[PDB]
Design a binder for this molecule. Structure first.
Ligand code: B12
Ligand code: B12
Ligand SMILES: C[C@H]1O[C@@H](n2cnc3c(N)ncnc32)[C@H](O)[C@@H]1O
Ligand SMILES: C[C@H]1O[C@@H](n2cnc3c(N)ncnc32)[C@H](O)[C@@H]1O
Ligand SMILES: [Ca+2]
Ligand SMILES: [Ca+2]
Ligand SMILES: [K+]
Ligand SMILES: [K+]
Ligand SMILES: [K+]
Ligand SMILES: [K+]
Lengths: 551, 177, 136, 550, 176, 136
């Protein structure tokens, strides 16, 4: 005889999630493992000889890169001698300036900073994160994709995402050969929705760089690094190849970050017996060592791995905190499905949403999750109204705003009309007036007419093989009745000339104003200081739909 | 045991073949992909799809990596058409082509739990038509936002064991079905 | 330059020239439609990257500055060759001699001394850690 | 033509919630209203002459009570002069001890402490709450009710709730005449599930005190106070009647707290133009002034009012923080429905769950919400697995644990049989073996056979009118096959003799051990100090159902 | 449809008083879900009268709280039994001698009341008047009633409250 | 008593007696069943409440201690009369004279001086704030 209470609980979505007991020998443990090395460092003649228990004669490529470029050796011995509990206390103490902490953490070893944050509970970590976040203003990044790679829908969804507040937007492709079309549609739509939104198209690394060189992207993020040598090898890179890639992006004036995240090494089969958090700390120091300004982390695509084991979502917040504490921009995930439960995914989001990070999510789905080509995000388009309500409930700036349906329809329509003009001016397969209308009123690709995919594929690849660059898109908009959009597209390209938006946490707001950690420095010093939601931004967030007036 | 190795694989002669390249654990450590589809069945449907389009189907095993991209690249190296199909033990599949970066592809099937034998058959049918220098309508994209929540931990565990069968330096072996 | 000089677009836009020595103001819609500026004109310069490197150091970001100094050296390398060198650094692609000739090319032909040294460092460690052609 | 994007959003549950634009004139604003008074105090000859801009000549009963009893007048002038920003900084600074803060906050006026916490975001308030919480160990309180006032189901659900970890449980009645049966069922089932769980039955005030005098409850909580004089009056009390009532409960050895909560004055029609948080601070100071050890607050039953307006859920956390900062036990709501949305109610709960409070919820529903006679709680029985998963995800002790189905079935069955013996021994309308089996495997009252409600309430009212007391229940258990339960019930009554559990935040754990803020002092001083989830308790929380073992 | 006819007076055991709040049938004419006040009175009266008991309707002014509206009703009721009804629809069956905030039956989620429930309320009231022990009206409970209607309930009550007149004795009403 | 004496049940159970001078060990199932102890025996004493008041004061909780001192006085008032007095303090229940009589009776019959003063205070303030019988 069964308890009907337990029958009711067995049907709950959360019991469809994947949980596992810790498996230490294969690194299936989130943090605080017995196999993790004890922090240590020895320095002779300005060169590291021992790093976290490992002598330099046993260094893998990751150890060499971190030991040579990733640690401030002038104070490493000093900071290693400090008490880890006291250091954790300094992290969440509102009266210890961010500028006083960065010289300490950047002199820590990977094991040392993991030891520091592992003394903290999630409230302490959030208290620290609101201080250690590099940019004073938090922001947000969206995915814009669909399962058909329909460029008309991408441009419309991108315009709506930019209109709702995303400052970076990311696309990806079901069919890799479509990518030039996805990149152009994303860029056009983003500039229509808000001039200055930065766009990326996530592909294999050599392919993505070439796409950037031609001018069809604004930045790149999915430049992956990994925490053990055999995993890094199967990702088709070394720390030196990825460091060279980072400098190649900058040499073309393109902003970029790395991507890592807890659980990748487990997911790819060689965790070398270490906890997810310790291996992720190696990834963060690889990023620091390469001179890359920022990092997308917080498990990202492998969220199913840490979320399966105890303290996994706390470990995800800890890896975000390590990132910001090392003075990197942190695009803090919240971009990938891990649970059937609305309660559970909300708890996971609030860890970054409440204190704020440089990008609270690094991929909120601006489309319904069925169209999300990263296999689903932790939030999607159907959550927009909940997200705004929680901003208003808690007085938290989560980067987004309530919007009017009439405005969104207009801006989606303009984005599709602008792309239609690009495709006509550049001689690409027609975008018909029926599709402009469909993209205007769509929720997702189920509302879109089918396109001739093989004709799109052929002309997308001609963009690459004939090196058709971003100036052709400017010209088409200008010859097609979109002088305003053409100018905004030109202004995005000009930002690649100044180097300004290469700096830590840089986005582009207002009338082409770069806003980075350099000129928007976080100055948190406790209550009533630091970023506060107020003024007209608060008026924007208050104005949710359905609020009845009693006057 | 339905796969036997006849010798080290050879650079293909003619231009009307597709190489199916399977990972090292495929068909022994596990005879079934992540959702219970028999391995023998996956070959048969992919093999059938290649031949009903008028093209030969070759099958090879790879050993140097358990990663389905590097497996497939070994196939497209030896395929006289330049086209290959990489298949992992837990079911992950990719259609690859000579000249492409190892982590690029022609078509990719990156959620193994969603693959059906019908989808496997259209893969071999599309792969052959690539070998014929046609541009087939790519297999319709399969995507389920709950695939990772349900199976990603199981995928990591299954792949962890796949990596036990990797043999550094050992060249690919030819396969009779 | 110091953080007070940042952003260059706002504080010192005249410091920003292009590879072909165009000015920010030269990039107008009218000039684009008539090919008076092209994509070849529209590329960041080593001087601009070295200014940002100066600003990064002043912000306390020495590693970012070193990235920018590497990038300054790499503006001289054409797009095609950038991708060749990147690929040649990926695992199992290159012999040690091929890597060392890339480094001598970078140094001799492009004066990319930091990048050349970065590549030689990789070649040495790729031997001990077995990431050269034929080590797979 | 209509956007399918906005068609999809219009269908979302959150768009069925009630929202309103701020209505200053009627107090429909959560905090930081331009009508709230500027903080101030003046003292002459040891008596307050002005409180927050108001002269003593114009004091209402609430001002008089707070001015005379609720503020440490020795330091109030000094504290009033301090920078409210620095005071807010001190609340969340991990290196400023709770014991250094309590002397300052208890010298503040209601407007002063509101000004302090209004400088804080919710992360700062949570950082402060984990320090100012009076009891070092967080706990949890459940509702145990059903729409039929079925006593067999109350005893079984209470036993399950105690077994899952609740340290206090509360019942309420669809038909008020049923209350003695609800109370006895709750007390019996709670002791079966874990001896020491404290129980209450929430009623009209004079009725509830009488039931407590008879020994059928262990404590009382819904002892309501209000933040304007006209609302207090419709509440049928004054500060002096509620203060007398508090001392009356203590004079019988019964633990009690008051209940308040933002938005009650708006709901009851006289907010006097003030923000919800300011009026709620008046309520917190009334509680302090009466010498009451703790307070249920965090909007509680009026949660639809602050949640309708901007920053209302932040204001709810702020009023919890004020309560703890004033060195009161805080039973921090999370006990009432306000939204159709799972995302939204989770954000509201995490404000208290993440730092911990004395009672993270003051009425998690241990029954499905269709049976919740407080009109639904913010969590219910169908959330138990999610709650345990989040504890494990975040390494946060939320007070509850995973439990085995076989254990719950056995403990529910024992509780039903124990109440069966009580009813038989007291000659109450019988509990049949069929009802015992139904309650054992029930999810809620839809699984229960119908009772004769008219006969039940006849005999329930005879318990009151013939003054049948708690020793009759002990006797029925001891003569009916349940001497173990009888002893546990007697041990509850014996705790009313010692006074130990009258103190701030007291619960009774383990083998009859009182655990209060006196002997479980919160000593938070930053990372790796204060309460930490670890040891066997962590092992218990990690063992959620369904974890594959590779 | 409601006309005052003078101060209500204490004639005996065969009557149930319906006590309505100050704005009932005046500035508010429907309850919180739109049920007309005239329809509600009709069904409550019919339920009382079907039981062989007289119904007598009074308007109360000293408080807008439904318990205190019912209490002045139960003081004047010849049977001691009364029904209190706010404009927004909240209803209680009260009894002389009980504390103001106790009752016999309470209907604390007005959005769930139907015209059928109102009729059953009048029936139960009259049966209490006859010193019978009716099976209580089956309990209505909806965990979403507060999420949907509590803010509107507060707004409607704030408005009902404006018609309170302290010290003003209740007025007997004739129904049209 | 001090916080170091708390909990009395663990550190000094012998200090805890009942209204009729029974001890904690007197409350057993056997003594309940036989009526050797009864509900009247089973009530907290003013001595125990005054010990807890001392502990509250030592813990920094003066207002709580005041509450416990009021409670100690009230242990001597019967249950029926506690309820009469509580109701008499509710709004519109009493004339001023009726509340002053309660205060005198509290002091003279039960020596409950603190409670007497508290009721007198209410009586005074109920006049000004109009909470007496006939003010509704
Ligand atoms: C998890 C994931 C990863 C993980 C784990 C990969 C691994 N080998 O274990 C990480 C983050 C490490 C990763 C890296 C990359 N990924 Co990936 N990844 C995903 C993601 C988000 C979900 C897949 C999933 O969870 N499936 C559910 C499980 C249960 O099924 P599965 O069959 O076991 O899934 C496996 C495959 O998806 C495989 N895989 C994952 N990514 C890639 C990429 C390629 C080229 C191949 C052959 C296989 C592969 O890894 C999973 C675990 O074994 C998908 C998005 C999607 N739409 O599916 C992208 C996706 C498949 N990845 C993609 C890409 C481009 C990459 C990278 C090349 C990016 C880079 N910066 O180098 C690398 C490739 C590294 C490698 N050796 O495979 C693209 C493929 C685009 C295309 N049309 O070809 C996708 C579709 C996302 C995108 N940007 O569009 N990826
Ligand atoms: C919100 C609420 C309150 C609020 C608002 C009361 C008000 N007058 O505005 C607060 C917290 C202040 C409150 C106080 C009390 N409440 Co109340 N309350 C609730 C609750 C949780 C939800 C009702 C709701 O939101 N309905 C949705 C709205 C849209 O419908 P509505 O018709 O507008 O709701 C109104 C009525 O419920 C009314 N109301 C609320 N409580 C009470 C109690 C009584 C006796 C009366 C006549 C009316 C009443 O106020 C609501 C707003 O106007 C219910 C639980 C339940 N099962 O319904 C208890 C409940 C109705 N309350 C109850 C009690 C006992 C009381 C108090 C007497 C407790 C006390 N310590 O004194 C006081 C009475 C004060 C008063 N003057 O009404 C009991 C009634 C039991 C019974 N069978 O008689 C309930 C059922 C809970 C319980 N403990 O069992 N309550
Ligand atoms: C691209 N991408 C997404 N997730 C990850 C990860 N965890 N590690 C590395 N790269 C990633
Ligand atoms: C009992 N109860 C529940 N909620 C409240 C409140 N907000 N104010 C007063 N009393 C309450
Ligand atoms: Ca991203
Ligand atoms: Ca409660
Ligand atoms: K990439
Ligand atoms: K990692
Ligand atoms: K009560
Ligand atoms: K209140």
């Amino acid at each position: 005889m069964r308890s009907k209470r337990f029958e009711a609980l067995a049907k709950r979505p959360v019991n469809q999630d994947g949980f596992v007991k810790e498996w230490i020998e294969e690194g299936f443990i989130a943090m605080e493992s017995p196999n993790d090395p004890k922090p240590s460092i020895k320095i002779v003649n300005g060169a590291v000889t021992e790093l976290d228990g490992k002598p330099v004669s046993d260094f893998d490529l990751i150890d060499h890169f971190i030991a040579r470029y990733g640690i401030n050796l002038n104070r490493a011995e000093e900071v290693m001698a400090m008490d880890s509990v006291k250091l954790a206390n300094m992290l969440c103490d509102p009266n210890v300036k961010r500028s006083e902490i960065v010289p300490l953490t950047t002199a820590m070893t990977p094991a040392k900073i993991v030891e520091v944050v592992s003394h903290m509970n999630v409230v302490e970590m959030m208290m620290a994160m609101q201080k250690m976040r590099a940019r004073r203003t938090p922001s947000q990044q969206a995915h814009v994709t669909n399962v058909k790679d329909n460029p008309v829908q991408i441009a419309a969804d991108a315009a709506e995402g930019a209109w709702r507040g995303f400052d970076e937007q990311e696309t990806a492709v079901a069919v890799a050969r479509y990518a030039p079309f996805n990149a152009i549609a994303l860029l056009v739509g983003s500039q229509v929705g808000r001039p200055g939104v930065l766009t990326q198209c996530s592909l294999e690394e050599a392919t993505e760089l070439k796409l950037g060189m031609l001018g069809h992207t604004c930045y790149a993020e999915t430049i992956s690094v990994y925490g053990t040598e055999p995993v890094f090898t199967d990702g088709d890179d070394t720390p030196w190849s990825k460091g060279f890639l980072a400098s190649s992006y900058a040499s073309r004036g393109l902003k970029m970050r790395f991507t890592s995240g807890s659980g990748s090494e487990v997911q790819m089969g060689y965790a070398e017996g270490k906890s997810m958090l310790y291996l992720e700390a190696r990834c963060i120091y690889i990023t620091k060592a390469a001179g890359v300004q920022g990092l997308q982390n917080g498990s990202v695509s492998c969220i199913g791995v840490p979320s399966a084991v105890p303290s996994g979502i706390r470990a995800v917040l800890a890896e975000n905190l390590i990132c910001s504490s090392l003075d990197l921009e942190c695009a803090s995930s919240n971009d990938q499905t891990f649970t059937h439960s609305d309660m559970r995914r909300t708890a996971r989001l609030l860890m970054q949403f409440l204190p704020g990070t440089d990008f609270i999510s690094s991929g909120y789905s601006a489309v319904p999750n069925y169209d999300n080509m990263f296999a689903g995000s932790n939030e999607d388009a159907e959550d927009f109204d909940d997200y705004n309500v929680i901003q208003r409930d808690l007085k938290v700036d989560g980067g987004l705003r309530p919007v009017r349906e009439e405005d969104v329809i207009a801006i989606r329509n303009k984005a599709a009309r602008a792309l239609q003009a690009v495709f006509a001016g550049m001689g690409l397969p027609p975008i018909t007036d029926e599709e402009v209308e469909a993209a205007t009123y769509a929720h997702g690709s189920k509302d879109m007419p089918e396109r001739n995919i093989v004709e799109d594929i052929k002309f997308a690849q001609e963009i690459i093989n004939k090196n058709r660059n971003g100036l052709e898109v400017v010209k088409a908009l200008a010859q097609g009745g979109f002088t305003d959009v053409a100018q905004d597209m030109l202004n995005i390209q000009k930002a690649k000339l100044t180097g300004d938006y290469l700096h830590t946490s840089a986005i582009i707001v207002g009338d082409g104003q770069v806003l980075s950690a350099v000129n928007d420095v976080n100055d948190y010093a406790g209550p009533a200081t630091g970023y506060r939601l107020q003024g007209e931004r608060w008026e924007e967030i208050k104005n949710i739909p359905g609020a009845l007036d009693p006057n | 045991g339905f796969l036997t190795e006849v010798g080290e694989a050879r650079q293909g002669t003619q231009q009307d073949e597709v190489i199916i390249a399977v990972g090292p654990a495929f068909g022994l450590a596990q005879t079934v992909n992540i959702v219970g589809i028999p391995h023998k069945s996956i070959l048969r449907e992919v093999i059938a799809g290649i031949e009903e389009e008028g093209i030969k189907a070759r099958v090879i095993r790879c050993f140097k990596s358990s990663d389905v991209a590097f497996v497939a690249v070994e196939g497209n190296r030896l395929s006289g058409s330049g086209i290959s199909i990489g298949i992992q033990s837990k079911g992950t599949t990719v259609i690859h082509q000579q000249g492409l970066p190892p982590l690029s592809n022609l078509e990719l099937f990156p959620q193994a739990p969603l693959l059906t034998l019908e989808t496997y058959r259209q893969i071999g049918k599309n792969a052959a038509r690539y070998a014929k220098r046609e541009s087939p309508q790519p297999v319709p994209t399969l995507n389920d936002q709950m695939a990772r929540p349900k199976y990603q931990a199981k995928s990591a565990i299954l792949h962890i064991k796949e990596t036990k069968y990797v043999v550094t330096g050992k060249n690919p072996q030819e396969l009779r079905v | 330059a110091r953080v007070s000089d940042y952003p260059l677009a706002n504080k010192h836009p005249e410091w920003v020239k292009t590879a072909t020595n165009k000015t920010l103001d030269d990039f107008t819609l009218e000039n684009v439609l008539s090919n008076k500026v092209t994509a070849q004109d529209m590329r960041i310069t080593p001087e601009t990257l070295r200014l940002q490197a100066s600003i990064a150091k002043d912000a306390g970001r020495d590693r970012l500055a070193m990235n920018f100094e590497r990038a300054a050296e790499l503006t001289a390398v054409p797009d095609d060759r950038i991708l060749e060198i990147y690929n040649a650094l990926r695992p199992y692609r290159s012999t040690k001699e091929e890597l060392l000739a890339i480094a001598d090319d970078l140094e001799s032909r492009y004066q990319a001394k930091i990048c050349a040294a970065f590549v030689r460092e990789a070649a040495t460690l790729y031997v001990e850690r077995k990431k050269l052609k034929g080590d797979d």
